[PDB]
Symmetry: C2
Subunit: 546 residues, 2 copies
């Protein structure tokens, strides 16, 4: 019976006037911070080898080349990845005010400050209400005291709020929303971002017409090494993709559909996406609270982006990708040493968050999730009561509506999975050896190892469709081999195992052969079945860790 507050605010949708440009486009080229280079305007900065040993160090500390970043201006210019028609939209000038919240943890100085400098340089002043930095219990000394003094520049426009304990990224974002009173809309940004020219007007205009639209900018890639900016490779060409997921709830992207394109008169106007990546988005501040922010059961590193996406869509909102508003996000490099917090019940925290989102939102679909991850089936996912009552009090639409009206494409790229026959370890009958993946993927060979019952790479499942699978990958027969190999699976590919529980037999269907192994050397292979080997007898047991 509950509703959302009504739209008091009046706004006019923008108009596209080809060949006439403005009103939010800067008339003349943006002044470089340093003229010219090192890194303007997003021309790559390639260094070394004199800088080699220094660069690798900072990569260990930050996962980014801070050596380069340190010699690029905090006020650098940047390249325009925007489509041309973008330059010809005339916006109302009546946009809601914004607070941008940037959560950070141990962020390198120059990447965090260039982010803030980026926002100040390219957002019209009236609209920028405050920039709230949420320190999620930082370690490093340059982010305390030195930061407090520096921020005095900007005359109190920019504020920082420490967290007593490390709350985690999802909950940190919730605190941000609380700590940022001044703006009408919340604009969230990762702490290693560079925002593009005229990002704001296109981003905030759809929220203005309608307070239950949530806006996401197109997110572009900034090289961790070179600091050049590139768009993501997905979809449309133009290159418009909308956010999706497979049924283990991993984020995937898919091309913008013709069907959506039909809904829109012009190429560059916002479009509907079923879900957001998660780190950067815009909602009206009240409306976010009306959805109760982020489920406060998600511990860390959720799980977060999907929860809000379903809430907004199934409770009467829209989530829209705005092509005309672009933001660069720096992407990490190998060799970083920033580490997971210890957890006794694992990998409970993230997996547990996925189960929370599914159970409340997915409805009948939870079945697809549970056969992609059976390991999660009986996981203590916690109290979900108020979250289910919320959904019922606001008469929110079903996930089934969602999947057929707004998320129609997904099953075309990520097909529904077949139910499971069984899952768990594949252990040697009355032995303590298990088929162990070894983390091998795409072409490598599966081995035997001492059972640990910890799931992980000793966990498998059997399809009704006769696929033997670990994560996304299936095992099949190596050619020319009796060797069992792990590769990428497609719905009708490698339908070649059948498991008889009583027999203790896995049998390859195209040959006649039965799974068999050698205890030393630790090897797994298929040979003509002989009862009384007694290798070739296996059991499958649910791991079911708590």
């Amino acid at each position: 019976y509950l509703t959302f507050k009504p739209q008091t605010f009046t706004y006019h949708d923008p108009v596209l006037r080809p060949g006439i440009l403005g009103n939010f486009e800067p008339k003349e080229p943006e002044p470089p911070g340093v003229v010219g280079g090192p890194g303007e305007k997003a021309k790559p900065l390639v260094l070394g080898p004199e800088f080699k040993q220094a660069i690798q160090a900072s990569i260990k500390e930050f996962g980014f080349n801070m050596v380069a970043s340190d010699m690029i201006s905090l006020d650098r210019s940047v390249n325009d990845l925007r489509q041309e028609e973008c330059k010809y939209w005339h916006y109302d000038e009546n946009l809601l005010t914004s607070s941008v919240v940037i959560v950070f943890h141990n962020e390198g100085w120059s990447t965090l400050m260039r982010t803030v400098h980026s926002v100040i340089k390219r957002t019209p002043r009236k609209y920028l209400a405050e920039i709230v930095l949420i320190d999620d219990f930082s370690n490093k000394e340059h982010l305390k005291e030195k930061l407090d003094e520096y921020i005095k520049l900007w005359n109190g426009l920019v504020k920082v709020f420490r967290n007593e304990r490390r709350e985690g990224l999802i909950q940190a974002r919730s605190i941000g929303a609380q700590k940022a009173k001044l703006g009408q809309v919340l604009i969230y940004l990762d702490a290693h971002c560079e925002v593009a020219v005229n990002w704001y007007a296109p981003l905030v205009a759809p929220i203005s017409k309608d307070r239950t639209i949530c806006t996401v900018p197109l997110i572009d890639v900034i090289n961790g090494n070179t600091y050049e900016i590139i768009p993501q490779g997905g979809g449309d060409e133009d290159g418009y993709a909308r956010g999706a997921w497979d049924w283990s709830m991993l984020w995937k992207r898919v091309p913008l559909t013709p069907q959506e394109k039909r809904l829109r008169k012009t190429k560059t106007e916002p479009y509907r996406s079923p879900a957001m990546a998660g780190g950067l988005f815009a909602i009206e501040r009240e409306f976010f609270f009306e959805l109760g922010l982020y489920d406060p059961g998600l511990q860390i590193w959720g799980g977060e982006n999907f929860e809000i996406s379903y809430k907004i869509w199934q409770c009467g909102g829209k989530l829209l990708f705005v092509p005309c508003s672009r933001v660069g996000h720096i992407y990490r490099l190998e060799g970083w040493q920033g580490n997971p917090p210890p957890i006794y019940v694992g990998s409970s925290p993230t997996l547990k968050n996925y189960v929370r989102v599914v159970e409340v939102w997915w409805d009948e679909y939870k079945d697809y999730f549970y056969a992609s991850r059976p390991e999660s089936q009986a996981l203590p996912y916690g109290d979900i009561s108020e979250l289910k009552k919320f959904r019922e009090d606001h008469n929110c639409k079903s996930f089934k509506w969602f999947m057929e009206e707004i998320a129609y494409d997904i099953t075309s790229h990520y097909p529904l999975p077949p139910k499971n026959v069984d899952w768990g370890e594949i252990r040697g009958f009355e032995t303590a050896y298990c088929i162990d993946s070894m983390g091998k993927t795409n072409g490598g060979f599966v081995e035997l190892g001492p059972c640990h019952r910890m799931g992980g790479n000793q966990l498998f499942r059997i399809n009704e469709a006769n696929q033997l699978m670990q994560y996304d990958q299936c095992l099949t027969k190596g050619a020319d081999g009796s060797k069992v190999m792990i590769t990428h699976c497609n719905l009708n590919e490698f339908k070649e195992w059948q498991y008889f529980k009583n027999l203790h037999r896995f049998t390859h269907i195209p040959s006649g052969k039965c799974l068999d192994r050698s205890e030393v050397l630790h090897q797994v292979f298929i040979s003509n079945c002989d009862s009384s080997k007694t290798t070739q007898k296996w059991e499958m047991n649910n791991i079911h860790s708590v």
Copy 2:
């Protein structure tokens, strides 16, 4: 006219008497160090999860599960991986005495001491002359002082010699040979080894008949996490394999050939291998000096193992794998740290070592090496004069003899490579973007990136045979895509590129398509040929490393 000092020892080859045991086989089963567990007799030790936080720490420090090793006896018993008929060989007892040298650097205590305990427990006392530990400049405190005092246990049988600077593994082994004077033969062992029962007699008997035979034991795998022992998966039906190399000089193993089997009366007697893995072997001490030990130009790593193998074979020696003598070596796990020295730019000095071995030993073969690695072609490999004079003074046989008389089977598994047409970066014509691999292998897609001229993943080569290759892998075209992908390669596979330097064109041969790129985002694809396009224009330039 230089010659090796002749044999003066008279020794006789052992005799196999089936069904009669002895004479070096232990009479009764080996007593466990701790009765009732854990780790004996090489049962796997499976811990956790109470231990997991602790285990992951020690893996960071050592690359071994030290918490598991720490609770296994230094005197444990292990499993017998030897063939049964190994038990029935009767050896003379006339054998030579031996100094075992164990180089170490920051080795975990319990793995280093269990090695020594292993040797003391299973070597007959008369034959064990000393155990010389070479400390290559370790910093961990448990390896100093605590070690000196513990070692007093063996009444001075065991001795350790510190190195003033970290000399590196190869040179450390040379110092060992100098510092260990007592034995007639040198037995080298990695510092994380467990030697099998009756390893010694079979290992040292062939050196005894003939002072220019060099012996290698079969090297078995000790799991670095649960410490059960597994033989390596190697070709022979009996699991016997002989050491090889591809033409980039990467160590490889191949199955024991039928021809070698005709040469031998028995399944279990020693056999010829063209080269040794490197860490564990046995030579008569004088004879090693007569070969001038290890080329003192070899830098920290990159065998070295090959150098000695060619010396012994081409200067009148034999290198023999002894099945009956087995040694377990612990194999590392991911997560170590675990780190290279900073020297620029050999690069690497390791590549510099390979060129030293090739230039002196390979002869006309150096051509195969140089097209597998052209990057090495003009690398300052250093003074090689005395090493070439050695080969000439001793009248050493040609590599060509070597490859057709003793290493005939290599080119059957690792074919000679086709000459190169060009090699280097693949750069965009009058741009600063280069095709680069991103380190991608086996199925992934090759991208564009800012040129750095550092070789590495922006280095490629083109075959006479029309293969575009990086390391062992090839580029082909993977549909439905028009993207270019890397996979593993075979001599007649993916013969599909031709490069015209003047044209600035790479063209796909099966389609008519030409290599093309989009500068943003950085993408590489093959597209219909057009001459208008500046993309589709490429140079290939030798990157030279000094």
